[PDB]
Amino acid sequence: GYEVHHQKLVFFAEDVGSNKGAIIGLMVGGVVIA
Amino acid sequence: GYEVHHQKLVFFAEDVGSNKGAIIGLMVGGVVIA
Amino acid sequence: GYEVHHQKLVFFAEDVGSNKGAIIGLMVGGVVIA
Amino acid sequence: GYEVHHQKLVFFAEDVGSNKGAIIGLMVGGVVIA
Amino acid sequence: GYEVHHQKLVFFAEDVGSNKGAIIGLMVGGVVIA
Amino acid sequence: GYEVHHQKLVFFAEDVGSNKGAIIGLMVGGVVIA
Amino acid sequence: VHHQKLVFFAEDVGSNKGAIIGLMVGGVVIA
Amino acid sequence: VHHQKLVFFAEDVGSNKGAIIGLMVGGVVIA
Amino acid sequence: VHHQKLVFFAEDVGSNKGAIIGLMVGGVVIA
């Protein structure tokens, strides 16, 4: 048998998030000013 | 057998989120000013 | 047998979300000012 | 002054594609057989 | 003064692709058979 | 003065791709058979 | 006892997406 | 006892996405 | 007893994403 359970992944936050700047998950090329 | 359950993925937040800036998931090219 | 259940994916938030800026999921090219 | 040019993103191939299986960009859950 | 040019991201191949199995960019859960 | 050019990222191959198994960029959980 | 012009703007305000309050005593503002 | 022009802007304000309060005594401001 | 021009801007303010308060006594500000 194969049993897999209860995995997670959190990029920015969990249960409260604020953002006044730039959040990018993936960026091949560019400019970010924050 | 194969049993897979209870996986998640959270990019920005969960249960409360605020944003006053730029959130991009994927960006091949560009300019972000936040 | 194959059993897969209870997966989720949350980009911005869940159960309460605010936005005063720019939220882009995918952007091949451009400019964002937030 | 800002200049951002000539960026590319390639998932599977360019100039020739041949597929006799499964290709998925994003999957939240499920059984993929190939 | 900013100049950002000539960037690339390649997942599987370029100039020739051949697939007889499974290719997944992002998976949150599940059984992949190949 | 800033100049950033000629960067590349290659996951699986370039100029020839051949796959008879499983290729996953990101996985949060699950059974991969190959 | 003498309150006058608590918040004063002298030129354009481009956009308001938040609370501009002159005098706050009680209550709840969610902007 | 004489409160006057607590917050003063003399030219443009481009964007407001937050609390601009002249006098705060009590309450809750969530901007 | 005489309060005047606690916070003074003489040129442009480009963007506000936070609390600008003249006189704080009590309460809760979440900007």
Swiss-Prot record, chains G, H, I:
Marked site positions, Susceptible to oxidation: M24
Outcome of mutating M24V: No free radical production. No hippocampal neuron toxicity
Sites where the protein binds Cu(2+) 2: H2, H3
Region (Interaction with PSEN1): 13-31
Superkingdom of the organism of origin: Eukaryota
Residue(s) at site: Implicated in free radical propagation: G22
Site (Cleavage): K5, L6, F8, F9, V29, I30
Impact noted for substituting E11Q: In CAA-APP; Dutch type
Protein name: P3(42)
